[PDB]
Amino acid sequence: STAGKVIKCKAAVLWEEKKPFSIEEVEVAPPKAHEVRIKMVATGICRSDDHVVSGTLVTPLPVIAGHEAAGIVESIGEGVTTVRPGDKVIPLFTPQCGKCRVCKHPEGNFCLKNDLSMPRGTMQDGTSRFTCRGKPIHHFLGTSTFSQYTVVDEISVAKIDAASPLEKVCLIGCGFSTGYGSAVKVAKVTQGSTCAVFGLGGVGLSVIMGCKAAGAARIIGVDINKDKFAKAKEVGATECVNPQDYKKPIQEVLTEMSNGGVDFSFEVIGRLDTMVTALSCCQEAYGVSVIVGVPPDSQNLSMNPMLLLSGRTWKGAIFGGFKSKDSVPKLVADFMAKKFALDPLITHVLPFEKINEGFDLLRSGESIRTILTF
Amino acid sequence: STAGKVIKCKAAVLWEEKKPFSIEEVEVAPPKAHEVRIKMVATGICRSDDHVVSGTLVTPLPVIAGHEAAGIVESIGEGVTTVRPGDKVIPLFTPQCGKCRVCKHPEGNFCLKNDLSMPRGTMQDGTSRFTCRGKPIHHFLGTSTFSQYTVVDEISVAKIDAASPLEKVCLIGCGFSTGYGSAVKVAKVTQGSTCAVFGLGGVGLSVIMGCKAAGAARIIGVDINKDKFAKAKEVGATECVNPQDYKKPIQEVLTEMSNGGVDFSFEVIGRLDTMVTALSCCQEAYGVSVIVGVPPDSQNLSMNPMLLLSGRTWKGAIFGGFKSKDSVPKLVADFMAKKFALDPLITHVLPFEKINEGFDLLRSGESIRTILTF
Ligand SMILES: NC(=O)c1ccc[n+]([C@@H]2O[C@H](COP(=O)([O-])OP(=O)([O-])OC[C@H]3O[C@@H](n4cnc5c(N)[nH+]cnc54)[C@H](O)[C@@H]3O)[C@@H](O)[C@H]2O)c1
Ligand SMILES: NC(=O)c1ccc[n+]([C@@H]2O[C@H](COP(=O)([O-])OP(=O)([O-])OC[C@H]3O[C@@H](n4cnc5c(N)[nH+]cnc54)[C@H](O)[C@@H]3O)[C@@H](O)[C@H]2O)c1
Numbered sequence: 001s002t003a004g005k006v007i008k009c010k011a012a013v014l015w016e017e018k019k020p021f022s023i024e025e026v027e028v029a030p031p032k033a034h035e036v037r038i039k040m041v042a043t044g045i046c047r048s049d050d051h052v053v054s055g056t057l058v059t060p061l062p063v064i065a066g067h068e069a070a071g072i073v074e075s076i077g078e079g080v081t082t083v084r085p086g087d088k089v090i091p092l093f094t095p096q097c098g099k100c101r102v103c104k105h106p107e108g109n110f111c112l113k114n115d116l117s118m119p120r121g122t123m124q125d126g127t128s129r130f131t132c133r134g135k136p137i138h139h140f141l142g143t144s145t146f147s148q149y150t151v152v153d154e155i156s157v158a159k160i161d162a163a164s165p166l167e168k169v170c171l172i173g174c175g176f177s178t179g180y181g182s183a184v185k186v187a188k189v190t191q192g193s194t195c196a197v198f199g200l201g202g203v204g205l206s207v208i209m210g211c212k213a214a215g216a217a218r219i220i221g222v223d224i225n226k227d228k229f230a231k232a233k234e235v236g237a238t239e240c241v242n243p244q245d246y247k248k249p250i251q252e253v254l255t256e257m258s259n260g261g262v263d264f265s266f267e268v269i270g271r272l273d274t275m276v277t278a279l280s281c282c283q284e285a286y287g288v289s290v291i292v293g294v295p296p297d298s299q300n301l302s303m304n305p306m307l308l309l310s311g312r313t314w315k316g317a318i319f320g321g322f323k324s325k326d327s328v329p330k331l332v333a334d335f336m337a338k339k340f341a342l343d344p345l346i347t348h349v350l351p352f353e354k355i356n357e358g359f360d361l362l363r364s365g366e367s368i369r370t371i372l373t374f
Numbered sequence: 375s376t377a378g379k380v381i382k383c384k385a386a387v388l389w390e391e392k393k394p395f396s397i398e399e400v401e402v403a404p405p406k407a408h409e410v411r412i413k414m415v416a417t418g419i420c421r422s423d424d425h426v427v428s429g430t431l432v433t434p435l436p437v438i439a440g441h442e443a444a445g446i447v448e449s450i451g452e453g454v455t456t457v458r459p460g461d462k463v464i465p466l467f468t469p470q471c472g473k474c475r476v477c478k479h480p481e482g483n484f485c486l487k488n489d490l491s492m493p494r495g496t497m498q499d500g501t502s503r504f505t506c507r508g509k510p511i512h513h514f515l516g517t518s519t520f521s522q523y524t525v526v527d528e529i530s531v532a533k534i535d536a537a538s539p540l541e542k543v544c545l546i547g548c549g550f551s552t553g554y555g556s557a558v559k560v561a562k563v564t565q566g567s568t569c570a571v572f573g574l575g576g577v578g579l580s581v582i583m584g585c586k587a588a589g590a591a592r593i594i595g596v597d598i599n600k601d602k603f604a605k606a607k608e609v610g611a612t613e614c615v616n617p618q619d620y621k622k623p624i625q626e627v628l629t630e631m632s633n634g635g636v637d638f639s640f641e642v643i644g645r646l647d648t649m650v651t652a653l654s655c656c657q658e659a660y661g662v663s664v665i666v667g668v669p670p671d672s673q674n675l676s677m678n679p680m681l682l683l684s685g686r687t688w689k690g691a692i693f694g695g696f697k698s699k700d701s702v703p704k705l706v707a708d709f710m711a712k713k714f715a716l717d718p719l720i721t722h723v724l725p726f727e728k729i730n731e732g733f734d735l736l737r738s739g740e741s742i743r744t745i746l747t748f
């Protein structure tokens with residue numbers, strides 16, 4: 001009943017940094033060639049959405065943020081072959097065009113069509129599908145999931161199991177897959193190893209889940225908020241440390257705890273200082289450190305390259321290294337077969353209209369993931 | 375006969391920074407338990423020895439430098455089982471104790487007994503075997519090869535083929551193995567890949583040799599001294615670029631030349647700026663950059679961690695990642711079996727007494743390796 005028509009719906013528009021979202025009517029254009037219009041069902045609040053608000057992650061404003069979500073296809077543009085109306089789908093904030101040198105590479109996942117490295121806040125064709133108060137509104141990472149309806153490029157959507165519980169599997173669209181893949185795929189955590197995870201939010205807990213799945217013997221959670229420790233232990237941390245409790249810097253503490261440095265460390269916060277601390281705490285000759293946290297816009301870290309010369313490996317990744325369109329449906333299938341759990345990440349559920357309360361919960365330290373239902 | 379006796383011999387003593395070496399008589403104590411006294415046959419001039427002179431690499435002075443060498447065992451202390459008098463040997467500036475967590479790790483080589491991290495300039499027992507004009511003289515990296523005789527710990531020496539040409543295989547003690555292993559073992563260069571090698575001295579040329587052995591399709595040499603280009607092409611560079619020839623930063627040039635970034639880059643100079651440039655020029659999603667150059671003492675680089683978050687891998691290594699005592703004999707056997715060439719690295723052969731002339735050749739840009747012969 002809406003195919004080929006403009007849809008008026010509610011979205012959460014961010015007009016200005018450091019302000020609440022405005023829940024108000026937008027116009028959503030119909031999908032053009034190779035585009036998909038999705039009726040959203042559930043979306044998570046990821047710290048990267050907050051980074052848009054805080055100016056940590058710069059993207060053009062005004063904007064419809066949201067990137068961790070699931071929904072149902074309402075209509076498809078001309079030439080779409082990979083989804084149909086009524087399919088359950090997860091928007092892919094990292095696209096998989098299948099054609100660029102990264103998509104063709106066996107390891108690569110950061111498709112060259114992404115809108116993260118130099119955000120423009122458009123569709124692939126450089127235009128917007130959103131109008132609000134007669135004004136064009138930017139997209140976010142090609143997804144814009146804080147809206148009852150969004151339009152995405154076909155390379156930014158994956159079809160998932162028709163029997164999927166969308167209020168759970170939305171987390172496969174960012175935080176779970178990112179953390180789990182950062183452990184199992186990017187770091188390649190080994191059986192019997194010692195891991196250190198800096199930051200025990202939704203992504204860091206997913207890193208712990210991956211470290212445990214990989215058979216780590218020790219998984220040391222690190223957070224300045226000790227309220228995060230109980231859940232971290234529930235999902236596999238063997239011990240938790242708060243840097244504020246120690247006179248010495250936590251890299252020294254972790255090196256001593258691990259009898260000379262950890263096998264694998266993960267920065268899952270987004271601070272320059274913890275990226276360097278996380279590198280330093282891995283064993284100097286054979287340790288691996290993975291950066292997951294999003295750094296503050298345009299800021300450089302300072303480090304001593306002797307940390308690398310001794311033999312450390314330092315890497316980072318987007319979306320856990322997963323090729324997004326290949327991987328998302330398989331992760332959903334694995335979830336359905338109980339290969340991993342998502343409930344430990346979900347601490348709060350709210351209607352979409354209470355999005356601002358959801359962001360308050362994140363900023364206060366109370367929540368891990370709040371799931372918003374449309 | 376000399377066994378059990380102090381030897382008086384000639385050595386090149388460095389009394390203070392930024393002065394010529396002093397060629398004079400030293401006293402070399404006999405080996406204690408688990409020590410080996412070696413009559414030197416040939417030693418190469420590595421830029422790392424010059425770093426001791428320039429104060430780039432801090433180690434206690436006064437010192438007998440030299441770490442890239444080969445010689446013949448003169449005597450063994452109590453308890454030595456791995457070499458005997460008369461054996462050809464290569465001193466190992468990275469030891470292999472076989473007992474520490476690094477030596478036991480499949481991918482570690484930076485043995486915790488090394489004297490590089492926190493240089494003491496002694497034997498393992500904390501004492502020196504050298505005196506000169508009634509003063510104790512420091513060791514360097516447990517080797518001290520700028521002397522007609524040295525004493526090393528057993529964990530810092532490897533027995534090699536009795537038919538080895540020591541005036542060639544001394545380069546397996548540092549520069550060849552470092553560069554070759556940085557390509558084949560640390561980076562794991564792949565067939566058909568594009569590599570960029572920053573710095574075309576003895577170590578960078580050895581990196582090119584390894585990239586070619588690994589089947590790289592393109593190997594781009596980068597040096598500010600265009601006199602280095604002919605030999606780089608002889609050993610496998612497909613093209614060479616001088617950053618001074620370009621208006622753009624060379625990372626932009628290399629990204630354009632490689633249609634979006636190289637597969638593997640190597641920093642083989644020792645500059646903070648080239649370490650960051652070499653990281654930046656590797657493909658942002660799947661590129662690998664290896665730091666080989668020794669950085670200036672206590673100086674930090676500045677970089678944007680988004681270079682890593684997109685998917686790059688950054689690592690460094692000492693001695694090409696090779697477990698030294700296992701690997702050096704095999705590299706010598708491989709050389710004897712014609713698996714690689716050393717002559718391309720050797721531009722000058724001088725008597726030991728001409729050490730300062732050998733350093734002046736390196737500093738002027740006019741040599742790759744000078745081999746000093748005793
Ligand atoms: N690489 C990717 O693809 C990707 C994906 C998803 C999230 N992210 C980023 O990953 C980070 C974590 O996201 P999230 O889990 O949703 O965030 P979160 O829920 O805010 O968790 C961050 C945790 O870090 C803790 N913390 C803050 N400061 C410190 C400190 N100094 N030391 C130790 N702990 C500290 C904090 O208490 C919190 O529990 C954010 O920067 C995101 O932007 C990146
Ligand atoms: N990691 C290890 O185990 C290890 C082993 C051996 C050597 N090293 C280091 O590796 C580096 C190279 O050693 P080497 O090959 O004996 O030295 P080298 O022979 O002096 O070669 C260095 C090359 O870098 C070139 N160069 C200098 N500045 C620049 C610049 N700005 N841009 C591009 N090219 C430049 C220079 O012209 C020369 O050809 C030194 O820092 C050594 O200390 C490390």
Ligand SMILES: [Zn+2]
Pocket residue numbers: 095096097098099100101102103111112113
């Ligand atoms: Zn692509």
Ligand SMILES: [Zn+2]
Pocket residue numbers: 046047048049067068174175
């Ligand atoms: Zn996210």
Ligand SMILES: [Zn+2]
Pocket residue numbers: 469470471472473474475476477485486487
């Ligand atoms: Zn060891």
Ligand SMILES: [Zn+2]
Pocket residue numbers: 420421422423441442548549
């Ligand atoms: Zn050297």
